[PDB]
């Protein structure tokens, strides 16, 4: 029973807060406009009558043919690099129910920012590459500590407040808690960002597919375009092979045992320093090569990636944004974020951040 009255047009719903026990409260908003639309549903921007704050309302159709875990997954998430779920409510495809997700509004994405630099024929300054990638890895370290795999990491899903340079991970419609022993769907993740084991049709993959996707984002930011484009899986695997070289049998086995006995032509690897421009920082290349690995267990964990030498500049007390402001909060790690590897705290929390 959505009451819609006038003040400016006001919409009133009884919505359930994202955290804690379900205690629904009346929420009023105004100034509704579509900021996005697709076959999944509608996305609106609105203004909360009470606080005046801007929010996004992601309206998604309750598709009973597929597993809908998005709500249940977002409700347990609370992190500075993951978009906050403020409230949710249901509403009325006649005779069908829609889920409404009220999130913090974040004005930009990594994709849109990167596209500015591409059509300007400029490279994204390394400092932003460090900042955006670091925060991505933090959010991954967080969701992976719960056993949650995003399964759709890509620039369009990385929200940015470019004033504060804060990155927030969004879109958990593909996310799932992976359980060793229970099969998963292989046709997941978006084109350009699909890990090789997924292309080979593995159903037993792990959270390390998110790390591969992140490696593709990193490479994209350095390159100015996707590193592994292609319409189909074979198209993409060819691009991958053209960079990494043909995977060995042991590597093929780590991805998908069912392909171990085919004789693939042996293509030589293209050295990473030749893949990127000659101005590219060595440690970015090093980090990227440790993310884009055939063998899923050989890839860095998100927490290990944060500790990589590429992000050393961010651990400098004197570091500052090009606009003049300070960097976001980068060192406020919880025991949960560090649960995968507690001794990494020595590196991740610099001395000046201890105080």
């Amino acid at each position: 029973s959505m009451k819609v009255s006038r003040d400016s047009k006001v919409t009133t719903v009884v919505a359930t807060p994202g955290q804690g026990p379900d205690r629904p409260q009346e929420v009023s908003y105004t100034d509704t406009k579509v900021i996005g639309n697709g076959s999944f549903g509608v996305v609106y921007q609105a203004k909360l009558c009470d606080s005046g704050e801007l929010v996004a309302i992601k309206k998604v159709l309750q598709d009973k043919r597929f597993k809908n875990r998005e709500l249940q997954i977002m409700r347990k998430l609370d992190h500075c690099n993951i978009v906050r779920l403020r409230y949710f409510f249901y509403s009325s495809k006649k005779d069908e129910v829609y889920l409404n997700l009220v999130l913090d509004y974040v004005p930009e994405t990594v994709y849109r920012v990167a596209r500015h630099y591409s059509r300007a024929k400029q490279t994204l300054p390394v400092i932003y590459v460090k900042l955006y990638m670091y925060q991505l890895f933090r959010s991954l370290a967080y969701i992976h500590s719960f056993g949650i795999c995003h399964r759709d990491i890509k620039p369009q899903n990385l929200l940015l407040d470019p004033d504060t340079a804060v990155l927030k991970l969004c879109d958990f419609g593909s996310a799932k808690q992976l359980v060793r022993g229970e099969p998963n769907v292989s046709y997941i993740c978006s084109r350009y960002y699909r890990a090789p084991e997924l292309i080979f049709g593995a159903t037993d993959y792990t959270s390390s597919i998110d790390v591969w996707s992140a490696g593709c984002v990193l490479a994209e930011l350095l390159l100015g375009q996707p590193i592994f484009p292609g319409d189909s899986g074979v198209d993409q695997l060819v691009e991958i092979i053209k960079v990494l070289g043909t995977p060995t049998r042991e590597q093929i086995r780590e991805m998908n045992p069912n392909y171990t006995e085919f004789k693939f032509p042996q293509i030589k690897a293209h050295p990473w320093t030749k893949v990127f421009r000659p101005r590219t920082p060595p440690e970015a290349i090093a980090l990227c090569s440790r993310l884009l690995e055939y063998t899923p267990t050989a890839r860095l964990t998100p927490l290990e990636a944060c500790a990589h030498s590429f992000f050393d500049e961010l651990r400098d007390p004197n570091v500052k944004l090009p606009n003049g402001r300070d960097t976001p909060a980068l060192f406020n790690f919880t025991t949960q974020e560090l649960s995968s590897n507690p001794p990494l705290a020595t590196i991740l929390i610099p001395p000046h951040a201890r105080h």
């Binding site: 009973k64 597929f66 875990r69 399964r151 759709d152 593909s174 799932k176 997941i188 978006s190």
Partner: peptide
């Protein structure tokens, strides 16, 4: 690319 079926 949707999640798994039911």
């Amino acid at each position: 690319p949707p999640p798994s079926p039911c």
